[model samples]
Target: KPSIVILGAGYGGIVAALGLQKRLNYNEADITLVNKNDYHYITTELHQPAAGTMHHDQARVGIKELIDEKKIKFVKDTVVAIDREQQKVTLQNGELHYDYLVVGLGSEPETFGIEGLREHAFSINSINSVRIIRQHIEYQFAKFAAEPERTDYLTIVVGGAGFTGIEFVGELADRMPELCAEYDVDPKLVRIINVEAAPTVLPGFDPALVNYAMDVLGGKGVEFKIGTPIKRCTPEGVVIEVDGEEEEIKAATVVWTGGVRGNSIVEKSGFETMRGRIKVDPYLRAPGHENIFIVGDCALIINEENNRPYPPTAQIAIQHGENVAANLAALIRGGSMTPFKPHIRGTVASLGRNDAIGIVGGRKVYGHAASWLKKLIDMRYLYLIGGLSLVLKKG
Candidate 1:
């Protein structure tokens, strides 16, 4: 029997694993899923935990309960490299030979060669990374209480006004008052700054929604530095170019939500890539490698409308998983493969837990309605992957 190996328990990998087990029988193929952790973290909800608003475990779903052990074997290990020529995957502790492979390892922070960013700034990328950010925020407040003159502890500078940056700032703004009360610090002195090189927040989004988001976050004390480019990042803070002049803002916590590129491993594996992402074929297969399917952040799909690649999102990644599984099953049974088409329902950005802005189902929504819709969208995914039981357990 042919063996199928899926890498990373992210949105794409887990769905592919589940989809395959449902489509293939025990006598047809042997399936294995490999991931660094035993749990799958919701990437979209990571901002909540990083801000200490939601419990980390709430964002994580244990993989063991989700997979059928009799059909799909789960391997908890880190992938070191992929020997694509030999059709083998090398993990830190073991290895596997694969007749078919799914690459869904996700992304890494793209610092764009910015100085001091890798060492001084924090990024909300993983469960471990977010947990550390939550703890680090508390540590800064504790230090401020010890030394009241250290105002830097009360200042936080977020680099970028993109989706992650805006969502993170919203959560951070909501978390500030509670943290200040706990540390006996003055809320008025605390600053939550959002710097974006773009001329406006949520660039290319609906102007009305963008204005609403800015107002909501601004009312919560988030200062926006629009049209300002960050020249460099230092231990003190980020240096921004203002009117062709450079100025530095000093803050103890500088979270870089700037951008992300595909995982380094994809490039290391010698796949034809751009910025670590492979421009997959219409069927979502690596060029000239029919047995390999690249999904999630590692896969790039261009939008025909704007002649630009579509931004990688959980919605598209889930669709990728579904399409890949369908195609793989078709191949095994000597059937045909179909092209992947993205059905973009809508986009929602949370402004804390109570407020949000979005365009859902051909209508613009904001305030409480959008926030409620965001939760529903998240719950919808849980329902898709693990059904109502998982939704109730995690919701």
Candidate 2:
């Protein structure tokens, strides 16, 4: 039987594996999935847990509980490297030789050469990473209470006002009052500063929505430093340009949600990549490699409107997985492959638990209605992957 090996049980890989098992017969093909962890975490809801607004357990689903053992095999191992020349994947424990390969290893935090960022700054990239961020923030508050003179410990400098940064600040702001009361610290001394190099927050989004987000988050004590690029970062805090002058903001916590590049392993495999993402063919195959499908963050699909690559998102990754599975089924059944097209249903960004902004079904929604839609969308995704039971459990 032809073997299909998928690396990384992220949104794309897990979806692809589930789609394949449902589409193919028992004897049709052999499927194996390899991931660093035994569970798959929701990348979009990471901000909530990072801010301590939601528990880490709420963000992850056990991989063993999702996939069928009779149809799919799951391997818990880290992918160290890929040898395209040999058509093999080298994992920490063993090797996988595949007839067809799916690359969905996800992305890495792009530091953009900022000084001291890699060493001192934190990022909300993974479940484990976010857990540390939450604990660190709580620790900072406790430490500040013990040393009342160290007010900097109460300052949280979030670099970037993107979806992750904005949502994280909203959640953090919501939890600030509780955190302050618990630590016996004055709320006035706590700061949640949001810095963005872009002149506007959520650039390219609807202007009214951007204004609304700014108004909402600003009302929650999120200080915006728009258009000011961080010149450097140190253990103390981030240095930004202010009116052509360098100014450093002293803070204990500096979290960067600025940028992300594709997984480094994609580049290491000798595939042609721009920022570690492969420019995949219309059928979602890596250039010059027909059997290898690159999905999620590792695949770069461009938008014809502006000739820029589409921003990587879970929605897009899920669509990518579906398309790849369809193409693979066609390949196995001797049918022609269909080209991939992104269907953007909508986008929603939450501003705390009760408020949000979104574009749903070509209509703009705001406030409580948007927040309800956001929950519906999340629950719908859960239903898609693991049926109504999973939704009841996770939702």
Q: Residue 323 in candidate 2 has what lDDT?
A: 89
What is the lDDT of every predicted structure here? 0.92, 0.92
**lDDT of model 1 at residue 268?**
92
All candidates' TM-scores?
Answer: 0.98, 0.98
lDDT of 1: 0.92
Candidate 2 deviant stretches above 4 angstroms: none
Clashing pairs in 1: none
Q: How well is each residue in 233-320 modelled by candidate 1, as lDDT tens digits?
A: 8887888899999998988889999889999999998898998999999999999998999999999999988899999898999999
RMSD to truth, every model: 1.0, 1.0
List residue ranges in candidate 1 displaced over 4 A: none
Find the 10 residues in a row with the least total lDDT in model 1: 21-30
